Each structure stands twice: as C-alpha cells, then as structure tokens.
Paper text:
The assembly conditions were further optimized to produce a sample with an average pilus length suitable for cryo-EM, allowing us to determine the overall structure of the [name] complex to 4.1 Å resolution. The 3D-reconstruction of the complex (map I) revealed that the pilus rod sits at an angle on top of the usher. However, the rod was initially not well-resolved due to its flexible connection between subunit FimAn-1 occupying the pore and FimAn-2 emerging from the pore. To address this, multiple data processing strategies in single-particle analysis were employed, which significantly improved the resolution of both the pilus rod and the [name]-bound usher. Multi-body refinement in RELION-5.033,34 further enhanced the resolutions, yielding 3.6 Å for the pilus rod (body 1) and 3.9 Å for the assembly platform (body 2). By combining the maps of the two bodies, we constructed a composite map that includes both the assembly platform and pilus rod, which sits at an approximately 51° angle on top of the usher. Multi-body refinement provided insights into the movement of the pilus rod relative to the assembly platform. Although restrained by the rim of the β-barrel and the extracellular loops of FimD, principal component analysis revealed a twisting motion of up to 11°, as well as side-to-side and back-and-forth motions of up to 19° and 18°, respectively. This flexible connection likely enhances the range of the pilus, enabling it to bind mannose binding sites on the epithelial host cell surface more effectively. Importantly, it is only between FimAn-2 and FimAn-3 that the characteristic angle observed between adjacent [name] subunits within the mature pilus rod can finally be adopted.
Residue numbers in the entry:
A (entry chain K), C (entry chain I), G (entry chain E): 2 to 158
B (entry chain J), D (entry chain G), E (entry chain F), F (entry chain H), H (entry chain D), I (entry chain C): 2 to 159
J (entry chain B): 2 to 19
Write the structure that this text describes.
C-alpha cells in the first residue's frame, strides 16, 4: 500500500589479504588544520604548529606481522623539497609559497615517494592505533589564501 | 611484505595575513540546541533559551591589532526579521515560522548580512575566546519539525 | 582594518509539540562501557556489569503530561535475542557473538522493536532525569575486538 | 605475555610569558550555586547570596611583578545590564530574567567586556590565591528553570 | 605589564519556584561507604550497616509550606527487589547480586519509583536538614567487586 | 499520548581476552596541566612540575597474570628527544620547544614507541591503580602558547 | 503541593572477600603535613616533623586471618630513592628535591612499589587501627613550592 | 594472601623558605562563630562576641626573623566597609547586610586587601602562637541566614 | 619581608531572629559514650550508663521569650522503636541491633520526629544552659562493633 | 513562638564483648 521508490545506497571497501585491516572511519577522513598567520610563515623555511591525525588498524594478527609502517603518496612542490606536499585546492586564488607536511612517529617529515615508509610500530592484538601529525611548511614568502591538499597512504606489514 | 593500499586523507585549512588564526575546532563546529517545545515559540517575538558557542582565536599578536570583531552572514527568513537565520535542513520536515539568532557578547542579536560586525573585543597575546549565544526565534506560530541552520562568519581586526 | 573569512558554523535541533523537550546534552551523547574480559562473557546468557547513562528532560509541565516513557530502536543481533543491540562498527576487528543490552530503571531489558516503551516515570514541573543502564549480553563465546553500537530513542507522554 | 590495547589520553595546558601560572584546578572549574527561590528573586534589582570561588596562582615572582588583576569575558544578558551573564544550558529549560554577577574582592560586580580589570591584589613569592564570589542577579520577574553560565577570564600582572 | 588568558569558569545552578532551596553542597554530593565483607553479605537478603548522609534546605519559609519530603529515582536491581539501587559503575570489576538501599528517617527503604516520597518532616524558618542512610542490600550470594551507585532526588514541599 | 523522537545514543567498548579490564573512566580521560612559565622553561632540558594521573584496571585475576605494565605511544618531538611528546593543537597557536612527557612510578621518562613498557606492578584480585606523572620538558628556549598533546597506552600482562 | 528536582546523590565503596573491611573514613582521606622550612630541608637526607594518621579496619574476625599489613604504591623521585613519594600538584609552583615519605609504626620507610608490605599487626575481633607517619625527605637542596602527593594502599591478611 | 584493594591517601602541604613553618592544624583550620540574634545587630556599627582562633608557628628561629605578622585576604562586603568579610555561603538562604570582622591582639580590625599587616609579634626559638578574634559586624539591618566566610592569610617576617 | 602564603581559614555561623543565640560549643560538639559491655545490653530494653552533655544559649532575653525547648531530628531504628537513633558509623564493622537515646532534662527519651520538643524551661537573662543525657539502648542481643550516630536539633522560644 | 535550629551532636562510642 502506497509503496513508493526510495533512493540509492552505495557501498565502499576492500577485501584486504593482510594482517590488519584499516578502520572504516580512517579509510576516508578529513583533517581540519585550521588557520595560519602569514607572519609565522613569512620567513623561508618557516614551519607552523602541527595537528595530529591517527590511523586505526583493526583485527591485527600478531602471529604473522609484528612491525607496521605507512608510506604517503602525494604531489611534491619541487624535486628539492620532496617532503612537502603541494596544494590541490579546487578553486583559484590559493596560498602561495607554502605546503603541508606529514610528520613521522619520531617527528620527521615523510618522503612522498612510496618507497620510504614510516617508523616501524609494534602491532597489538585487535585494535592498534598509530599517530601522525600534519603541519604547514613555508618554502618562501607566504601569501593569504585557501590551502587544501590530498594524500594517499599504503601500509606495509 | 603484504603491502596494501589503505585510503586517503584530505587536509583542509586557510592561510590568512591577519593577526589571529581561528581555532581548528572553531572553523567548523556543530552546535546542538536539543529540542524546543512549541509552547515556548507559540507567539510571535517569543525567544527560546540560548546555547553558548565560542570562537577561539590563536596566536593573537596584540602589537599589530588591538581588538577584533566578528560578523555573521546567512539567509534570513524574511525582510521583516533580518536578524534571524532561516532553516536549511532538508526539503521536508523542517519547522515553519521559526528561526535562530546569533547573540553578540553585548547581548544584542547580530545582523545576518556579513557587513554588520559585533562589538569590539580586546585581545591578548595568546588564546582569545570570543563568546556567542544561539537561540530560537519565532516569526509566528511554530509548528513541530526539525531545525538546522548554517552561517558563515568573518573576523575583522582593528 | 584587515578582515578575513573566519569559517562556517552549523546549528542543529528539533521543535516538538510534546510536554517536554530533551536536553542538548541528551539528544546526542556517547558513553564508555569500558573493556570487558572475555572470561566474564563465557557462555550464552552471560551478563557483564552495567554502566549508567540518562536522558534529561526540560519544561515538563505536569498539566500537559504526568508520565514519560521511552522506547529504544537499534539493530538486533539475533531473531531470538530481540533485546540485544548488534555491534555497529567497522567491518573488520569487531567483537563477535556479543551485543549491548539496555536496562530500564526497573532492571529489565528493553525491547528494540520501537513499540515496547519503558516503565512510566512521573514528571515534575521542571528539569527531569530518566536513568538507564548499558550492559553486555553474550550469545555464545565472546571474542576479542571492539564494540560500538548506536541506538535511537523515542519518548512518549 | 598478553598485550591489550587500553585507550587514549589527552593533556591540556598553556605556556605563558607571565609572572604567575594559573593553577590546574582553577583553570577549569565548576562552581555550584544550588537553588534560588523566586521569592528571593522576585522584582528587578534583586540579588541572591554569593558563592565563593578563588583562582590560585602558582610560581609567582615578586621581582618581575607585584600586583595581579583579572577581567572576565562573558556574555551580557542585556544592553542595559552589562555586568550580568546570560544563562546557557539548552535551547529550552533555562530561566528568564536571571543571570550571574561575579564580584571581586571589593564586593563590586565586574563588567563582561574583557577590559575592565578587577581590583589589584598584591602577590607573594610562591603560591597566591585571589578570592572572588558569584551571585544571582535578576533583571525582572524570575521564572523557574535551570541556570548555567560560562565565562573566561584574562589575568594581567602589572 | 603583561596579560594572559587564564581559563574558563562554569556555573551550575537552578532557579525554582519552591518553598525551600537545596544547598549547593547537597545538590551534588559523594557518599563513601567503604569496604563490606562478602562473608557478611553472603546470605540472601543480608544487610550491612548504614552510612549517614543528609540534604540541607535553605531559605525555608514556613508561610509557603510547613512540611517537606524527598523521593528518589534510580535503576532498580530487580523487578522483585524494586527498592534497591543497581550498579552504575564501569562494565567490569563490579560486585553483582548486591545493591544500595536508601533509608528514610523512619528506618525504611525508599522505593525507587520516583513518586513514592519519604516521611513528612516539620519545617522551620531558616536552614533545615533532612537525614538519610545508605547501606548494602544483597539479593543473593555477594561477590567481590566495586560498588558505585547513583540516584536523583525530588523534594516535595507541602 | 504524544510520542516524539528524542535522539540517539552511542556506546564505546572493547571486549578483550586480558587479565584485567581498563576502567570506563580510564579508557578516555583528560589531564589538565594548568599553565607554566616561559622564564621557568627557558633553559634546555628544564623540567616543570609534574601533575598526576592514573590508569585504573578492573576485574583483575591473579591466577592468569600477576604483573601488569603499560607503554605509551605518541609522536616524539624529534630524534634528539624521543621520550617527549609533540603538541597536537590547531595549525597556529601552539608553543615551541615544549612537550609533554610521562613518568612511571620509578621516576623515569617513558620511551614513546609502544615497545618499551613501564615498570611492572603487582596486581590484586580487584581494582588496581597504576600511577603516572605528566610534566613539561623543554628542548630549548620556550615560547608562549598552548600545548595540547595526545597519547595512547597499551596494557601488557606478564 | 510543589515538587522540585533537587539534584544527584553519588555513592562509593567496594565489596571485598577478606577478613576485614577498610573503614569509610579511611578508604580516602586528606592529611595536612603543614609548611616546612628550606633551612630544615637544607642538606641531602634531611627530615621534617612527622605528622600522624591511621587506617581503620572494621568487622575483623581472627579465625580466618590473624595478622594484617598494608603496602603503599605511588611515584618515586629517582631510581636511587625508591621510598620517597613524589609531588603531584600542577605543571608549575611545586617544590623540588623534596618528597613525602611514609613511615610505619616501627619507623621504617615503606617502599612505594606496592609489593613490599608493612610490618605485620595482630587482628582483634572488632575495629582495628593501624598508625602511620608522614614526613618530608630531602633528596638535595630543597626549593619553595607546594607539596601534594597521592598513594594507593592495599591490604594483605 | 587474600590481598584486597584498600583505598587512597592524599598528602597536602607547602614548602617555604621563611624562618617559620605554619602548623598543619592552623593551615586549614575551621572556626565556629556560633549564633547571634538579629536584635543585637540593629544599626550600623553593631558588634558580636569575639571567639578566638590561633595560628601556630613552629621551627622558628630568632637568628633570621624577629617579627611576625599576619595579613588577611578576603572578599570585602562593601567599598566603605573594607574591613568586613562577606558571606560565601550557598546562593540562597544566607544572611544579608551582616559580615565577619577579623581582629588582632590590639583589638582593631584588619583590612582585607592583604597589603596591610597585623601587629608584629616578637618571635622566640621554637613554637609560637598568634591569637586572633572573629566577630559579626553589622553593615545595616540584620536578616536571618547562614554565614560561611572563607579568608586566606599570609605571614610576614622581619 | 619574605612574605609567604600562610594558608586559609573558614568561619561557620548563623544569624537567627530568635530570643537566644546558641554557643559554638553547643552548635558543634562531639560527645563520647565510651566502650560498653554486651552483657550489660544482653536483653532488649537494657540501657548503658548515661553521659551528660549540655547546650548553652547566649543573650537570652526574657521579654522576647520566656520558655525554651529542644526537638531532635534523626533516623529511628524501627517503626516500633521510634525514639532511638540509628547508627551511621560506616557500612561495615558497626554494632548491630543497638542505638543511642537522647533523654531530656526530666529523664524521658525524646522522639526523633522534628516536631516533638523537650520540656519547657524558664529562661534567665544572659547565658543559660540546657542539660541532656546520651545513653545506649539495645534491642534483642547487642553485638560488638563501633557505634557512631548523629542528630540535628531545633530550639523553640515562646 | 519562634522555632529556629541549632547545630548537630555527634555521638562516638563502641561496643565490646569483653
């Protein structure tokens, strides 16, 4: 009686054949860096404060894997500055002479190549969360504007 | 060994040349006002209680800027009440003849046009928490439903 | 002098014609059950300790209504166990054969169908609080993993 | 042998360039005001009793500063009453025509603008405590309901 | 001089149109009961000794109401044993088959229905005190574990 | 008989095969460190005073394990000081050359990798408490600003 | 006539399987050591005046346990000072190179590891009281500040 | 054998570099002023009986310090009556227009600002005691109600 | 010089519109009944030796009121024995099946209801005293254990 | 005529089977 059409429901995910599976809330997440003053980034090589984002690994099997690492893939600003991530803002008028950096567990910038992985982290039965930090890196005289970027990650067990 | 692609992360931020930087928790926050009885908003001009939301400014350098004002931009319900915010929840199920206001620290409702700033608030060399209040406003008889709203805010430095 | 686009702010809420209105801290909330040892949840029908949450009502004019009742609604775990919440979390790394159970103030499991309301609670002309408990119910052998559940509630007067 | 994921912890603090550091307990605190009768708050200008609360300053240095003053940045209930906070608990249930006044050590209310500092208090080497009080102030005929207000403070060291 | 953001102060209170107001130290209190022997509570229907806690009433006016009473609400341990508090502690390491009973000044357990008020008490102009007791009641074989109950009370003035 | 939708409730827990279960109030807690002085933290390697927190373990069973230890996982400042956390706040406004660090009951800094556990504590057959002290560590010249750090702990029974 | 919601009443306690039960006045307590002088706590190994307190045990039976002892657990100062409880007040304004230490009835410091227990005391069929002293121990040149300490104790029978 | 969790114990105190140490029984002492009739306080300038409390100092040496004075800091009830302490009771049911006054050996009141000091007493090697008196000083017509006043104190040596 | 933070003090009292003021030693006193033998209280109705305390009234004005009386409010053990206070020492190790009784001046036990006042006593101008007796009262067979109770009292002036 | 309240009285004691 009065059965009407609904809509469309989509699904996403991957059937990984690995020790640990990435959390559904960590596969696709956003990191709200906030706002940065150009005064803190005016000098070449200047670095802003960092915010922390975590990656959650579920159903870890310590029987086959003990150490885990993560490598980040993105678009570098330049060959010389390969650890800094360029800005992929959709609209025009974005920030100039700035980028974003993903730090390591030991407070080191991660190379965006795919062959350099994060610091080895011990895995735990069940849920194992590993932390990361995201910060702004100024390659020169900063300029006000939007600043958004994207990066994928690949986990090695 | 068993290297597997995971997902992706989207960094969102803004670079400004002002003297303060809005907090990461303040650039996008979801104030929740709970439920409001129709008895409170039955008549025109009746205002519900207020729920406080505050915008935090970080790394404020007072040597270049003394005070800071915040203005709000949004869609008013009608020209009769240019100080409220129209509901933008969905096509159906929204409440009728109701709205939400944004109150400055002085106690006067702000103007949702993006040009009328708030009262000047002095700053200090550090974290600055500018307080605000959100209350429901009735433009007539309030019918039951949902109530969601979105408003942009701009910060001036004088 | 200079001005900058600060950001965006969202507001959420509901307008109701009932006698009471649910508090902003009670419309949406999260509780921490805490870790539970698998030894405690060994056989079917096992029960763990119960944490406490509550729902806050306001402006409860006893003239309009004197009693309040609550009916919950979530995802059951089995056809037989209609009163046990299923664990609605990420696909991998979730505890199995166990669910969350909601206890009314009379110490009884609340049906999740959405039509069986809780025991009637008398109201007063002012702020009110209705207590509830969350415990764990195991339908077999409990397994290690996380346990997150979401359940809506509906108040009757 | 067995290793189990426990949970997470967050540490919150502030590094400051002042003479005294605010105590951890006084940085975030919940003053309790119990209940107030409408007969006590019946007509405009009424005032309930005052509930005591103090802010503790740790690791003070007499050489760099000798006096301490504070100023509260809250939200005024009305444009005519700038020294009274506005209740903010939920969109429905709060009390009307009632706010809270914060009295300094001289028994005078402090305006909620963040610039009018309270009376100066001489400091001591080491731990120091600055006393205050909080009371209910009625702007008209009080109405039963909840009453929760928030206010941040800025401390100067002349 | 130098100024810094100290912190935030929250106030919690409630204005009510009642004959009496409840004390700030009595609206939210913690009662320590201490350890109790599983040997003493092993039998079904056992009873431990009681711990005394009291609720303070302020600004009582005998003209408005001459008597007062208190009713309690909380989660009952069982359907049969409806006058015993349940356990509101964490989900692990909590003593089962035991609960807490509220004893009125008449030495009787109070039903947790919320509409069953305790015995009437004569009021006087000024501060009043209403005494109560808390003790452990066993529904079977008591087991080792923690015990942290919780309840919410409604005061009736008539 | 009006029936109205109220809202939603979420639960969080982790059923584990462990000797002891972590307390509900300990799986996710906050530690307020108050404030600290730049003049105090000016020198490199200077340590401020330490505030105390603790992890509570419930439902311990000595039969399966008698000793418990935890290890804290976080983001170090750099390779020079691997035992000091790095602040995680908004992109602007945080302090520089200052980090939170954790000390066990032996008064030693804990390495932040999740592989080096704290000193093993003997457990009882009930509630147990593992204490820790969070303190500020300066890697150089301190700078005023906020400091919000995060860490995750992993319990091991052996 | 008029009904008004007053507030909440919390409870605390434990049910333990032991000969004795710790008194409610001793499950948690605050004891004041008073102020002390740096001139007194000048050199290493100094000692302040010892304040007294006690732990009360109720409902004791001697046919299931004859002797009792306690063990204290807290945070030590250094590796070379395993019986000096540290100071836990805040991130500023606390004394340095001085720590509270606990002495049993014999007059010997109790190790803060939680494993070593106090001197055995005989039990009586009734309320028992075990005395203790608290004092300041200087690990070096003491400095002005506050002194707040916490210690968790366990009872062996 | 059958080890069980006992509880927790808190130690509170201070370390100072002065020539005297305040006794633990006087650091946080409580004084009962009894009761007083409204008839005895009917006009400005009234007084009540003065009960005596002592602040005990031990480990004093005359080589370093010779004089000792105590300065009381509290919330003055009025600007004109700056030597009178207000009432930090609950928000309702407290007395009005009635304050507390702190005396000295000489018999005159002490200003509550804290800059001014009491009469200097010559110290002697060992244990010392400084007496004081507390009474009710009316600022006007008296009204019934409780009165709980908290005041800090500093000690000077010269 | 060398000013140090001595500490803090509290003052508790109450201003009442009554013909008499109660002395501090009466408003807060601790009376001790001492150890008793079970054989003395073997049967129901047997009582221990009675100790004597007293309450002191100050500034009693005969013109305002001439007769004084006292009513005690507490927790009765049973609905059959309503004149005996229950024990509130703790939740364990408290003497069972026994309570305390508060006999008036003439020698009769006073009901624990708040409206049952003592025998009228003529008041003398100045300072007066009212003597009361505290004793034990055991139903059934008394058992070893601590016996601590408490009760509030009201005074009526005619 | 005028009914006010005083303070409170705390009784301390023990029971022994000796």
């Amino acid at each position: 009686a009065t059965t009407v059409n609904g809509g469309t429901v989509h699904f996403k995910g991957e059937v990984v054949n690995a020790a640990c599976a990435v959390d559904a809330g960590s596969v696709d997440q956003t990191v709200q860096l906030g706002q940065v003053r150009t005064a803190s980034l005016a000098q070449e090589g200047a670095t802003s404060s960092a915010v922390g984002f975590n990656i959650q690994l579920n159903d870890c099997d310590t029987n086959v894997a003990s150490k885990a690492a993560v490598a980040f893939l993105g678009t570098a600003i330049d060959a010389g500055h390969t650890n800094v991530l360029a800005l992929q803002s959709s609209a025009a008028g974005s920030a100039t002479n700035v980028g974003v950096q993903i730090l390591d567990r030991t407070g080191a910038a991660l190379t965006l190549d795919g062959a350099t992985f994060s610091s080895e982290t011990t895995l735990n039965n069940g849920t194992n969360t590993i932390p990361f930090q995201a910060r702004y890196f100024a390659t020169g005289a900063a300029t006000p504007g939007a600043a958004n970027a994207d990066a994928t990650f690949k986990v090695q067990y």
